[PDB]
Paper text:
The transporter associated with antigen processing (TAP) transports these cytosolic peptides into the ER lumen, where a multi-component peptide-loading complex facilitates peptide-binding to nascent MHC-I molecules. TAP is an ER-resident transporter formed by two homologous subunits, TAP1 and TAP2. Similar to other ABC transporters, it contains two nucleotide-binding domains (NBDs) that hydrolyze ATP and two transmembrane domains (TMDs) that bind the substrate. For example, human herpes simplex virus (HSV) encodes the potent TAP inhibitor ICP47.
Here we present a 4.0 Å cryo-EM reconstruction of the human TAP/ICP47 complex and describe the specific atomic interactions that allow the viral peptide to bind tightly to TAP and lock it in an inactive state. With this map, we built and refined a model containing the 12 core TM-helices of TAP and the N-terminal 55 residues of ICP47. The presence of ICP47 blocks both openings; otherwise there would be a continuous pathway across the membrane, a state violating the alternating access model. In the TAP/ICP47 complex these residues are buried by ICP47, consistent with data showing that ICP47 precludes peptide binding.
Residue numbers in the entry:
A (entry chain B): 130 to 681
B (entry chain A): 173 to 322, 325 to 484, 492 to 742
C (entry chain X): 1 to 55
The structure:
Amino acid sequence: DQVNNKVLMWRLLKLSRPDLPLLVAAFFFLVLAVLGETLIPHYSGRVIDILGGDFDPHAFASAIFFMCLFSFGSSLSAGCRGGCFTYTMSRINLRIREQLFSSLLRQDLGFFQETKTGELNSRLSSDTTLMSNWLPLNANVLLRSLVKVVGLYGFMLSISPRLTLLSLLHMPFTIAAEKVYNTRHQEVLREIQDAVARAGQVVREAVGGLQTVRSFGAEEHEVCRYKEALEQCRQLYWRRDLERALYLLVRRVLHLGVQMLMLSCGLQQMQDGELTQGSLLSFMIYQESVGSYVQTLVYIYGDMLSNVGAAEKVFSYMDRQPNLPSPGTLAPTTLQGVVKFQDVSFAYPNRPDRPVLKGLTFTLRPGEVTALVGPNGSGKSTVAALLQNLYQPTGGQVLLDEKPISQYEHCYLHSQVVSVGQEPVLFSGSVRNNIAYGLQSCEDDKVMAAAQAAHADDFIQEMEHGIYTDVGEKGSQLAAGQKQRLAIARALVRDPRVLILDEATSALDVQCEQALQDWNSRGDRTVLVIAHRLQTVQRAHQILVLQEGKLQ
Amino acid sequence: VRRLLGCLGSETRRLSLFLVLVVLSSLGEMAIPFFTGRLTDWILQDGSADTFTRNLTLMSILTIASAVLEFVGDGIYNNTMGHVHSHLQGEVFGAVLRQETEFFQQNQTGNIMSRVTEDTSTLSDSLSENLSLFLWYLVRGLCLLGIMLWVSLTMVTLITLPLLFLLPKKVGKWYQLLEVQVRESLAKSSQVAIEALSAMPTVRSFANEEGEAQKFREKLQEIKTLNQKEAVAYAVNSWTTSISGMLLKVGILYIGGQLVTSGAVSSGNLVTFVLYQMQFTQAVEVLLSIYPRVQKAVGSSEKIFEYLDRGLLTPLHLEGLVQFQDVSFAYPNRPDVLVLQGLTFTLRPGEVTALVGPNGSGKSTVAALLQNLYQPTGGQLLLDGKPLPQYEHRYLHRQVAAVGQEPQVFGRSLQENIAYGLTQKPTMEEITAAAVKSGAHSFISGLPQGYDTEVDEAGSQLSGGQRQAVALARALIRKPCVLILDDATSALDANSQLQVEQLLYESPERYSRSVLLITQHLSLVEQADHILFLEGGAIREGGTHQQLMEKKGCYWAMVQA
Amino acid sequence: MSWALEMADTFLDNMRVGPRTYADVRDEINKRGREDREAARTAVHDPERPLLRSP
């Protein structure tokens, strides 16, 4: 726990190293803003010192002029550091989103089933911005205090050494209290979390067994047991508030205790020592803050570890990269057009003890047309995903032209292998972007000819801005037929070797596919026809009759 | 509003005692500037010890006493607010259980979890924090504006405040206009982030994942270019808000300086005026931040109030005859479209009833009717010559027993779970005999520390058979007349099914215990006394299995197919 | 918005010897951050539905 949070902090700061220079400028403007603010009492004292004795117009004018200038410069310097610190928050927040988004895309699809859409957003939106807020907020408060404390103690030491040691020696008395108060507080908060957790668990079990509680009918006991847990929980809030109010009293008494004991000697410093008239008023104005700034300094050191636990839940995504095979790229010099499955065993990564597909041994598919017969929930899409290499096979081997699918390149497999799904994948991009989805340099004539071959060209022609028509997110503007025809236009735009069809021809037009799957275009490779069309099943040569995760 | 205030107030007196205690302390809180003024004017003119010390002693006594009055007052406030927090949380929890089952059945858990604990906690937490500070600084404001009279000085300060809070909000509006664009452009990037990832396998199928990161990088750089203007705007706003402070402070030096030159009001009185004016502005500055949060909080409060505002016949002689006189069981959603319709039931003492039929053919509704959770829509459903509503909840709990379909188990120990729902505490011999009779004694004696073993969440430790056996012992421990079981032993073992069947049929207590349950096991029905062939609510036939087999009806078809 | 950083500056500008102190200032960020945590997830679709839909 303690080492983990330290190492995770040491990991956190390392991410900010590219934005070092601006933090040094922010440090310089902060030091300037503090050292400016500490100079405002010094002159204001000297104005009161000079003024009582004589009008002294040049001294009076100059002292006010410089004081008023330094205040203006301090106010300016206090702004620009804020402008730097708020800009620093943009750096880490925009950086972490890019790293998080890029890291998630590399992760396996099995995790996506486990992960919740609401949580993944919540961490991406809030939990990042907390982590980006962390370092500037911690650095600003720490650095502003550190410089101001040693500043004030310096500006005290310039005035006198006699009244400083007694005021300094009291700080251990305050620092010792905060260490007890914080250790008391954090334990009570963690106790309250556990108390509220037990009180909540009763509501969770009650909500879980509503019918049980209503059938037997002893609600009064459930309310009484909830009230019993609420009573002991209520005591923890009372202890916290009583301990805090007591600390307010102790601090309020101790503040004036040091102030009175100081000021009394401060009066003697005029009579006996002959220190200075205005310097007493300055030293008081300095003192007033000195203690109050230590309160932040003692708290921030201990408090630093609390916000680290928030980052851990983001870093949990970044931690692990275990899935998939080694990224080695076999390049297809010529289109082999040979799909195979040697003694395959398809099981889901989400749950190991479930029998999905076992002993899928056949292969030998190249010429003519291939068909994949099977009932509802037989696992035809699982075989298509196994052929396309979405999920890794639990047993056997998915060979392609006497070579492993994992050993194939990802771009080469995406280029060579294809799989026309039933439901059309929609995106926010334009018709050209959707038509050239995952294309490095798609040809304009190729995209238009692919759409014309796919039979969406009449729809694309009438559409506003033609090929640059903005597609509505989740398929808003385009119809079901256009959504299906778009997938045909994608397949035509690819012009890939292998091209499976998972229930695509049922919704879309029948005449469109055959022309693409005949002649020179058909020679790219065979097609795994997984669909309900018996006419397509009759026309095809090969017919894999699947049954109960086994070849009939 | 009126209901909000009327419900929340504690005593007529504890809060009144607190309010009087705050005022008397508040004068002691703001006593310091008068003593500071006296301390300053002493240095300029006077040189007496007694007057100076007397001032410091009164200063110290008032400041120390005020701290004690605050320490007590805050204690009484937090003690009273604790009672209100506990009372409101106690009242709101009961209001859930008071409402009918239709809301629980129709609506999901997430609503009834989040609306109860989180909303009531975060409301009362906000109210406790806000109302404390609201009533504190108002008394400070009124008392300091009071002592400020002891006319021209008050006329000055009244005119200044508006100018203090004019420029920050006026310039801050133009600052805020840019923020909504950053929020929208951020939400846009997150929208595209979720939209791109949501359909993962379509991205994974192709090699688009590399390309999308560039589109993400562009959408981020479009924010990055805008952020430069937002970052400097914060610094510009910081200057305008800060400079107004020096404009105010210098104005006081010039306006006060003329009064010092004229020599009407003294330097000490000027120091008090400056201290009170500086304290007043900083006090009021916090007071303005609550009024939005009250409007934010009260919006939830009215919905919590909207959520909240929605003849015990005793046990003595067990008659044991249930008459569904032309009954009609219908759900709360659809009044006309009933689950059970034209019910003509007629139970009796010492007779195993049965209700054979299809999936959702008034099976659960009939059992729920007999238990009397949801009342009958039409006709009548008397038990022992009297309506179920007439019986006392505890008495009906004792008389009627019903094992549910989903074998639920609480988080407590096996003794607590076995003896759940009872006024008097169950004896160890009773708990042991119930577990022995029901057939859970092997499960109870087999586990660690007997009945003291804590049951895990969602039935983790206990199995399906152990949960069903525990549910059987839970019902058996009461020793009730009516015995219900809708889909109880669905995934029951050979050893379990035989035990439940023996307890149902072979057991001596069955003579004084009616058993009307939706039988999963056919043999349990085949070896019963009374039966009914349900069909969309209405009973088609009602007799013996041999009679139904001989006549050839629903039971014959159900037995055959 | 970067609201949190404004609140710290407001506190560090006017310290005094008040009742709230920096201990509260962090709790305001914890409270407001948890509100954003609640608001973010509830904005789009539904939290119960995972990323991948089909079993």
